[PDB]
RNA sequence: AAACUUUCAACAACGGAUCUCUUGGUUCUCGCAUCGAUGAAGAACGCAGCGAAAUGCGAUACGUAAUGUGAAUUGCAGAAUUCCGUGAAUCAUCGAAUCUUUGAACGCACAUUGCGCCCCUUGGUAUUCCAGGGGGCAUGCCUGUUUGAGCGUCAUUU
RNA sequence: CGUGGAGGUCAGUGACGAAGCCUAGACCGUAAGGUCGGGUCGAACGGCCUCUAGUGCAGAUCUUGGUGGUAGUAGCAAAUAUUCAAAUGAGAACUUUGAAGACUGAAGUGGGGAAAGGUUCCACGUCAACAGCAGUUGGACGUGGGUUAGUCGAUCCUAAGAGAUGGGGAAGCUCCGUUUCAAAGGCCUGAUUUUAUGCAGGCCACCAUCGAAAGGGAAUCCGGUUAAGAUUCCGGAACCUGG
RNA sequence: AUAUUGGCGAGAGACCGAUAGCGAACAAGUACAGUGAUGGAAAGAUGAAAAGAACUUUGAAAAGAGAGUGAAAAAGUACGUGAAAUUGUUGAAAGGGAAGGGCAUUUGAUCAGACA
């Protein structure tokens, strides 16, 4: 009975969706995400799990703000406006 | 040969820069030389094709033919001539795509800016 | 068409608020039509236009506040320079260039001389 | 459309962020009409539908082809 | 150096009717089950992966470096050798070929080529140019696209325009006596370059 | 189901919208290279794990 | 003698070797020093006339402002006034903005689009009830401000 | 002898056809192999002297991919059962309708729900794949439509339990404690007729919060209506809470 | 003065050449598996140009046969070349419980050379 008839009773989730990473790794009774670590202020990760790091580092998403720091740096963090010219 | 440290002979880097050039850059790669006539006339060898220019095909199968440029199809690195087309089996008609380096410019469409360009290259006008 | 910002910036505060309403009415009516017509690109330009009006309105109100804070300690955090978080807390040049009483006396009396070898 | 001819009701797609109060008033203001009550539901494509019933003074049909549709 | 090895694959051990290489575990994807790490596996690591700490340069005793370049210089006289080496010098008056010092002062390519022609290079210059071919390798797409012979080697005592006037002509190389390089003196380790010495250069030799 | 949280309905909605064939006009664009929709999903061939 | 089997060849299948390609990978080397409470990295959901991706963006949503260029964009439709011009563009540059719901994530919660409090303002006959608009309220710690506690403790009242 | 790549050279071959591939046609070598012809093909490639190695396969229950004999074979046999005719359609053992024969037998093969699914619901179109015969049918494919609440649930309460906070451990990630060795907080109105909310009484010391779609719990019913919703819409008639 | 398998920007190689090179040359950390931590692929090439096959004909259709385009369909969105295993047809041959091989010659088929 340990095989398939037991599998018939598999209809309750141990994890739902994680707010911080959206992964369906938020263990309900434990109230913590098995992937990202939420609600722990820090983010879960480990040096023995490189591929996982790779799967989640900076650059694997939008970079809504960091994107632009280097242009900005390149120009000395100029402020103001650009004037005019001709042609 | 190359002599500067900010220029690359690398073939890989070249082809990339070609094929992924932005529209603004393709404007200049799409340059046709002027006609022997126009070249004396303006003292200046080539210009980036613009639309309503008048042009002569001097290469390939349509060699000899002439017309007004109808679009610079920058996306395709190709220029269509309003007058040079494929008629079909179903008699529908279709632009042939031509390459600026295989044309010669025969009348320029002129702007303030076009003239400004020609001057900037140290050329002269009529 | 599409309204131009350099012409918006000459309207009064209150003119722009109404052109914004005018635009919004149009966009309302445009979407009503959109679902009768097979295509309706005109809508794009009316809704870029709304952007532009808002852009110009926020622009002017900002420019106002900016000035009436210009040249005092303490101005709203979003008119302060952004720079970088660290840059933001680096020592000011005055703070950095700060030199000890004892030290400037030294710098003064014995400063690195310019000299040369030959004769 | 039928609710509009038969029920004196105006069906609208409405901001998800908005409640029956905000739907009610805005229909009232954008359309010069009087609203009886406002039923709402979330569509299965993540948009909100408002079943707006006008009062008996108004005639949704008339009112709908003076916003422009039909 | 991480390549071949980015798996958590294990052997399945024996008794499963199947070889014993490690195998990608898990499932649902076609990669799982597959041979891992081994140098005979698709996507394995290679055998004895190449390492950057291989020895690339070589040290030759300075003295013996000189025996060779000296040797190489002496052969640029011996005209049989020069002939043997490619190099079209039946036309050329005598060997060593020594041209006037006025050469070092030539600013302009076309004049440099004219000079060269007048002293007998012509036929050798033409042999480059006639010999440009597409490299047969995969070389042709690692920045080695074309191939061609070597021309004459003009040696000066003082560059007063001569290196730039010759810089753009196919196959033609320059050198200042004071240096003087085995790679150029005996291209491909075959003796007998065709050298054109300026007088100034030729006497500094001693 | 049958009584869901709004978060789930939302996902549910987003996944209905994604469940459509490739828009055939894309097939015509210069350099276009997408043959068909290669991320299509079916309710009885792949469960969506919420 | 056929059929059958086997062998070879031609043509046709199956299959995707081989050869030639390469906007990728690898390794070397040179220059440089810039994430975040001024809300980062990451998540979710959305946004195009006609998109499911990838790429971009954020209800101002494949973009707004500015600036340089100087006439395209293109799969179709479109605008059409935008072409000797404050001016085309799925262009480049980018200094100004917008930036949903979230995240160290900060009013409390969160398998909830769940539940307070304070200020300004508008509507409902309203300081108190309801509703709309805007602005706010985490924690440790530093300097300072104000209001305080303790026979810890000084002096001073008559 | 043979292969990738490098220096030199033959001013080597080549779109008037490189390379590759095919060929019980030719020729050289004892051999590794080398050369030609013919067919096919379409953009590059070779000889010689040297340099260099990720350099030669039949096996490793070798790795990946492809292919066979087996073989039109095992099989497609549990759940009593099917039949006539019309209609439609290129096509009907299998679709639709009519007729007949049976079945489940209300401990249901009926009428609804919880978990779980997530659009499968409904309509129109429609057969390439899929439903181990079939297909005109479908939970398939294409395009659309559809889920209406003061009273139904959530939301509120507490249960086992979970878990912030003054604190105490721990190098630290963190662990312990939940009223615990803490200066832990808000209500009723009085006081105001500068004036809006400061102080004048007194109380209350209960010390977070999360945790039930079966526990506790304010209140709605009947008739009608849709392709597809209904204690939610329409009609009528109530009731609860707050103001 | 030193370090640097990260970040930004550059120049390179006696490096790999689509089963190789990073896992990923592509909508690749995707699709897919797993309650979870994690695991994690396959997959590039018509042609200069779509000129992507009008039109007729047989068919219910898919398609076939013509025609047409093209330097070529012996390039037809199954698309450059297109090996081998393995398959169909055609031609030839052999076969009394395997086949294949060695020396030798008959027979059939086939072919080089030398002669002048
Ligand atoms: Mg299982
Ligand atoms: Mg559990
Ligand atoms: Mg915990
Ligand atoms: Mg937290
Ligand atoms: Mg320059
Ligand atoms: Mg120019
Ligand atoms: Mg072209
Ligand atoms: Mg614009
Ligand atoms: Mg500051
Ligand atoms: Mg009516
Ligand atoms: Mg509702
Ligand atoms: Mg290793
Ligand atoms: Mg086995
Ligand atoms: Mg590998
Ligand atoms: Mg060569
Ligand atoms: Mg080769
Ligand atoms: Mg299932
Ligand atoms: Mg007989
Ligand atoms: Mg054979
Ligand atoms: Mg054959
Ligand atoms: Mg290859
Ligand atoms: Mg090519
Ligand atoms: Mg490289
Ligand atoms: Mg360098
Ligand atoms: Mg992270
Ligand atoms: Mg796009
Ligand atoms: Mg557009
Ligand atoms: Mg301007
Ligand atoms: Mg841009
Ligand atoms: Mg906004
Ligand atoms: Mg919180
Ligand atoms: Mg909220
Ligand atoms: Mg607010
Ligand atoms: Mg203090
Ligand atoms: Mg004090
Ligand atoms: Mg050898
Ligand atoms: Mg070799
Ligand atoms: Mg190699
Ligand atoms: Mg022969
Ligand atoms: Mg041939
Ligand atoms: Mg050939
Ligand atoms: Mg070719
Ligand atoms: Mg060798
Ligand atoms: Mg090897
Ligand atoms: Mg062997
Ligand atoms: Mg083998
Ligand atoms: Mg074997
Ligand atoms: Mg062996
Ligand atoms: Mg094998
Ligand atoms: Mg197999
Ligand atoms: Mg059969
Ligand atoms: Mg049988
Ligand atoms: Mg039976
Ligand atoms: Mg059986
Ligand atoms: Mg039957
Ligand atoms: Mg019975
Ligand atoms: Mg019974
Ligand atoms: Mg049944
Ligand atoms: Mg039901
Ligand atoms: Mg389901
Ligand atoms: Mg159905
Ligand atoms: Mg069929
Ligand atoms: Mg099925
Ligand atoms: Mg079947
Ligand atoms: Mg069938
Ligand atoms: Mg459907
Ligand atoms: Mg649908
Ligand atoms: Mg109730
Ligand atoms: Mg509630
Ligand atoms: Mg605790
Ligand atoms: Mg609770
Ligand atoms: Mg309950
Ligand atoms: Mg209950
Ligand atoms: Mg009823
Ligand atoms: Mg209805
Ligand atoms: Mg129903
Ligand atoms: Mg009612
Ligand atoms: Mg009543
Ligand atoms: Mg009452
Ligand atoms: Mg590096
Ligand atoms: Mg370098
Ligand atoms: Mg690979
Ligand atoms: Mg290799
Ligand atoms: Mg791989
Ligand atoms: Mg590629
Ligand atoms: Mg796949
Ligand atoms: Mg291919
Ligand atoms: Mg192509
Ligand atoms: Mg045909
Ligand atoms: Mg040809
Ligand atoms: Mg061919
Ligand atoms: Mg071909
Ligand atoms: Mg075709
Ligand atoms: Mg190809
Ligand atoms: Mg082929
Ligand atoms: Mg024999
Ligand atoms: Zn998480």
UniProtKB/Swiss-Prot annotation, chain A:
Provide the residue positions that the database annotates as binding Zn(2+): 18, 21, 33, 36
Biological process terms in GO annotation: cleavage in ITS2 between 5.8S rRNA and LSU-rRNA of tricistronic rRNA transcript (SSU-rRNA, 5.8S rRNA, LSU-rRNA); cytoplasmic translation
What is one GO cellular-component annotation here?
A: cytosolic large ribosomal subunit
Q: Which InterPro entries does the UniProt record give? A: Ribosomal_eL37, Ribosomal_eL37/eL43, Ribosomal_eL37_CS, Ribosomal_zn-bd
Q: One of this protein's Pfam families, by short name?
A: Ribosomal_L37e
Q: Where in the cell is it found?
A: Cytoplasm
A GO molecular-function term, please? rRNA binding
Query: Secretion signal: which residues?
Result: none
Question: Which intervals hold the zinc fingers (C4-type)?
Answer: 18-36
The UniProt record lists the keyword Metal-binding:
yes
Q: How does it assemble?
A: Component of the large ribosomal subunit (LSU). Mature yeast ribosomes consist of a small (40S) and a large (60S) subunit. The 40S small subunit contains 1 molecule of ribosomal RNA (18S rRNA) and 33 different proteins (encoded by 57 genes). The large 60S subunit contains 3 rRNA molecules (25S, 5.8S and 5S rRNA) and 46 different proteins (encoded by 81 genes).
Report further notes.
Present with 21800 molecules/cell in log phase SD medium.
The record describes the protein's role as: Component of the ribosome, a large ribonucleoprotein complex responsible for the synthesis of proteins in the cell. The small ribosomal subunit (SSU) binds messenger RNAs (mRNAs) and translates the encoded message by selecting cognate aminoacyl-transfer RNA (tRNA) molecules. The large subunit (LSU) contains the ribosomal catalytic site termed the peptidyl transferase center (PTC), which catalyzes the formation of peptide bonds, thereby polymerizing the amino acids delivered by tRNAs into a polypeptide chain.
Curated annotation (Swiss-Prot), chain B:
This entry's Gene Ontology molecular function terms read:
RNA binding; structural constituent of ribosome
Q: Which InterPro entries match?
A: KOW, Rib_uL2_dom2, Ribosomal_uL24_CS, Ribosomal_uL24_euk/arc, Ribosomal_uL24_KOW, Translation_prot_SH3-like_sf
Report which superkingdom the organism of origin falls in: Eukaryota
Per UniProt, the keywords (alphabetical) are: Cytoplasm, Ribonucleoprotein, Ribosomal protein
Q: Which GO terms describe its biological process?
A: cytoplasmic translation; ribosomal large subunit biogenesis
Q: Which PROSITE patterns match?
A: RIBOSOMAL_L24
This chain's function reads:
Component of the ribosome, a large ribonucleoprotein complex responsible for the synthesis of proteins in the cell. The small ribosomal subunit (SSU) binds messenger RNAs (mRNAs) and translates the encoded message by selecting cognate aminoacyl-transfer RNA (tRNA) molecules. The large subunit (LSU) contains the ribosomal catalytic site termed the peptidyl transferase center (PTC), which catalyzes the formation of peptide bonds, thereby polymerizing the amino acids delivered by tRNAs into a polypeptide chain.
**Full protein name:** Large ribosomal subunit protein uL24A
Q: What organism is listed for this UniProt entry?
A: Saccharomyces cerevisiae (strain ATCC 204508 / S288c)
UniProtKB/Swiss-Prot annotation, chain E:
**Any idea which UniProt keywords this protein has?**
Acetylation, Cytoplasm, Methylation, Nucleus, Ribonucleoprotein, Ribosomal protein, RNA-binding
Q: Where in the cell is it found?
A: Cytoplasm; Nucleus
Which molecular function terms from Gene Ontology are attached? RNA binding; structural constituent of ribosome
| Entry GO CC | cytosol; cytosolic large ribosomal subunit; nucleus
* Cleavable signal peptide: none
Entry's free-text remark on domains: The eukaryote-specific C-terminal extension harbors a nuclear import signal and delivers the ACL4-uL4/RPL4 complex to the pre-ribosome, triggering uL4 release from ACL4 and incorporation into the 60S ribosomal subunit.
What does the subunit section of this Swiss-Prot or TrEMBL entry state? Component of the large ribosomal subunit (LSU). Mature yeast ribosomes consist of a small (40S) and a large (60S) subunit. The 40S small subunit contains 1 molecule of ribosomal RNA (18S rRNA) and 33 different proteins (encoded by 57 genes). The large 60S subunit contains 3 rRNA molecules (25S, 5.8S and 5S rRNA) and 46 different proteins (encoded by 81 genes). uL4 is associated with the polypeptide exit tunnel. uL4 interacts with its chaperone ACL4 and the nuclear import receptor KAP104.
What is the name of this protein? Large ribosomal subunit protein uL4A
What are the top taxonomic ranks of the organism? Eukaryota, Fungi, Dikarya, Ascomycota, Saccharomycotina
User: Which part of the entire protein is covered?
Assistant: 54 to 259 of 362
UniProtKB/Swiss-Prot annotation, chain F:
UniProt GO BP: cytoplasmic translation
Q: Which gene encodes it?
A: RPL39
Record-given protein name: Large ribosomal subunit protein eL39
Species this protein is from: Saccharomyces cerevisiae (strain ATCC 204508 / S288c)
| A Pfam family annotated for this UniProt entry | Ribosomal_L39
Keyword Glycosyltransferase applies = no
From start to end residue, where is composition biased (Basic residues)? 6-19
Query: Record's SUPFAM superfamilies?
Result: Ribosomal protein L39e
Q: Which HAMAP family match?
A: Ribosomal_eL39
Q: What is its main location?
A: cytoplasm
The answer, when asked if Cytoplasm is one of the entry's keywords, is yes
According to its UniProt record, which protein family does this protein belong to? Belongs to the eukaryotic ribosomal protein eL39 family.
Q: How does it assemble?
A: Component of the large ribosomal subunit (LSU). Mature yeast ribosomes consist of a small (40S) and a large (60S) subunit. The 40S small subunit contains 1 molecule of ribosomal RNA (18S rRNA) and 33 different proteins (encoded by 57 genes). The large 60S subunit contains 3 rRNA molecules (25S, 5.8S and 5S rRNA) and 46 different proteins (encoded by 81 genes). eL39 interacts with YIH1.
User: Where does the protein end up?
Assistant: Cytoplasm
* Main function: Component of the ribosome, a large ribonucleoprotein complex responsible for the synthesis of proteins in the cell. The small ribosomal subunit (SSU) binds messenger RNAs (mRNAs) and translates the encoded message by selecting cognate aminoacyl-transfer RNA (tRNA) molecules. The large subunit (LSU) contains the ribosomal catalytic site termed the peptidyl transferase center (PTC), which catalyzes the formation of peptide bonds, thereby polymerizing the amino acids delivered by tRNAs into a polypeptide chain.
User: Which PANTHER family would you find in this protein's record?
Assistant: LARGE RIBOSOMAL SUBUNIT PROTEIN EL39 (PTHR19970:SF0), RIBOSOMAL PROTEIN L39E (PTHR19970)
* Positions of the UniProt region annotated as Disordered: 1-21
